Design an enzyme around this catalytic site. Structure first.
Site, PDB file in Angstrom:
ATOM      1  N   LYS A  46       0.817  -1.222   0.000  1.00  0.00           N
ATOM      2  CA  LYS A  46       0.000   0.000   0.000  1.00  0.00           C
ATOM      3  C   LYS A  46       0.844   1.262   0.000  1.00  0.00           C
ATOM      4  CE  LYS A  46      -3.237  -1.173  -0.515  1.00  0.00           C
ATOM      5  NZ  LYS A  46      -3.542  -1.807  -1.843  1.00  0.00           N
ATOM      6  N   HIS A 107       6.429  -7.422  -2.543  1.00  0.00           N
ATOM      7  CA  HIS A 107       6.390  -6.816  -1.216  1.00  0.00           C
ATOM      8  C   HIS A 107       7.313  -7.520  -0.235  1.00  0.00           C
ATOM      9  CE1 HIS A 107       2.998  -4.542  -2.741  1.00  0.00           C
ATOM     10  NE2 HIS A 107       2.207  -5.607  -2.785  1.00  0.00           N
ATOM     11  N   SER A 137      -4.554   2.434   4.543  1.00  0.00           N
ATOM     12  CA  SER A 137      -4.754   1.868   3.204  1.00  0.00           C
ATOM     13  C   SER A 137      -4.820   0.342   3.252  1.00  0.00           C
ATOM     14  CB  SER A 137      -3.601   2.335   2.288  1.00  0.00           C
ATOM     15  OG  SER A 137      -3.778   1.885   0.948  1.00  0.00           O
TER      16      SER A 137
END
Ligand SMILES: Nc1ncnc2c1ncn2[C@@H]1O[C@H](COP(=O)(O)OS(=O)(=O)O)[C@@H](OP(=O)(O)O)[C@H]1O
Ligand SMILES: O=[N+]([O-])c1ccc(OS(=O)(=O)O)cc1
Ligand SMILES: O=[N+]([O-])c1ccc(O)cc1
Ligand SMILES: O=[N+]([O-])c1ccc(O)cc1
Length: 294
Positions: A46, A107, A137
């Site tokens: 995010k 990620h 988020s």
């Protein structure tokens, strides 16, 4: 067939909480075969992955927006660790058949990013974002994204986030790991808040890192097509093409608000005071700094 993996609690891979569907057959990640020309867009979730991925792809396409409308960003920039067993090929499989230069999204924290990327010297564009906006988020993302364990209430999710229990682990460790690793590796370390403040300035830095010279016309074209409004309304970037079974867009859109400072709308007075005190403890001893307002 993928349904049994959806909405399950996190698995764990090398000590890091992992999306349940992604975790099986993790060897395909540990042993991923990178190329020296690969460009990795690495982020804690995010923090601006899609934003930077679209910038990179537009730079590589010479600033032509039509070439980036060719396919959705999920396919143009495959996530390295993505998997949906029984429904889709893994991201690692899709990447094997992609021409150089590949743009690889991930990620994974630096210490479990596949060793091949480090050995091949692959250029990494890292994006960090202030942790309070990231938490907001990611909470709303987990409400809509059925790969994620359901987050429960915001206050309980925030406790999990601060403790590093969420998918991909501790934000503090993530952002500091890649900040340190630039000492031994080519990394361009960007800040989401910098990109909100002056997008052209950050596109220019990305272009230079990639060795690409941008005319003023191509730079303005890239800035105009990577505004939040543009990417929210663009079907190639707004994730509206993902099956509703995987992402319930009505719960929360992927391109949700796109600002710095939305944390002020979700953090209570008490949560904010407690988070700030913990953050100062966890960020002591690094020169890395994030802005919560611009
Ligand atoms: N162009 C542009 N401008 C400003 N903000 C943007 C842009 N593109 C994406 N976003 C916002 O980034 C959030 C999504 O982060 P990621 O793309 O890293 O999500 S993911 O981890 O890949 O799922 C999510 O943030 P929030 O709106 O705060 O939830 C997106 O809206
Ligand atoms: O969440 N952050 O990234 C964050 C939180 C607090 C902070 O500093 S303070 O002065 O607002 O405590 C800076 C960054
Ligand atoms: O980028 N992504 O699609 C994500 C990010 C985080 C997550 O937990 C699952 C998927
Ligand atoms: O491509 N896809 O179908 C996806 C990609 C990412 C995600 O988090 C969920 C679904």
């Amino acid at each position: 067939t993928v349904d049994r993996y959806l909405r399950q609690p996190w698995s764990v891979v090398h000590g890091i909480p992992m999306v349940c569907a992604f975790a099986p057959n993790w060897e395909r990640v540990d042993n991923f075969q990178s190329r020296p020309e690969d460009i990795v867009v690495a982020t804690f979730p995010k923090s601006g992955t899609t934003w930077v991925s679209e910038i990179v792809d537009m730079i590589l396409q010479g600033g032509d927006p039509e070439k980036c409308k060719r396919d959705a960003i999920v396919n143009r920039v495959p996530m390295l660790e993505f998997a949906a067993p029984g429904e889709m090929p893994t991201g690692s499989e899709v990447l094997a058949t992609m021409p150089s230069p590949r743009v690889v999204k991930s990620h994974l924290p630096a210490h479990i990013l596949p060793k091949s990327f480090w050995d091949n010297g692959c250029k990494i564009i890292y994006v960090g974002r202030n942790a309070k906006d990231v938490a907001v988020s990611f909470y709303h993302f987990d409400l809509m994204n059925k790969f994620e364990q359901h987050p429960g209430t915001w206050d309980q999710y925030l406790e999990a986030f601060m403790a590093g229990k969420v998918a991909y682990g501790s934000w503090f460790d993530h952002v500091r790991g890649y900040w340190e690793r630039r000492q031994e590796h080519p990394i361009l370390y960007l800040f989401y808040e910098d990109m909100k403040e002056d997008l052209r300035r950050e596109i220019t830095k990305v272009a230079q890192f990639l060795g690409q010279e941008l005319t003023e016309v191509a730079l303005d074209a890239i800035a105009h097509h990577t505004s939040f409004e543009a990417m929210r309304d663009n079907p190639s970037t707004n994730y509206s093409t993902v099956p509703s079974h995987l992402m319930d867009h009505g719960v929360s859109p992927f391109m949700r608000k796109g600002i710095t400072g939305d944390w002020k709308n979700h953090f209570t007075v008490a949560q904010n005071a407690h988070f700030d005190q913990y953050y100062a403890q966890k960020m002591a001893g690094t020169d890395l700094r994030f802005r919560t307002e611009i």
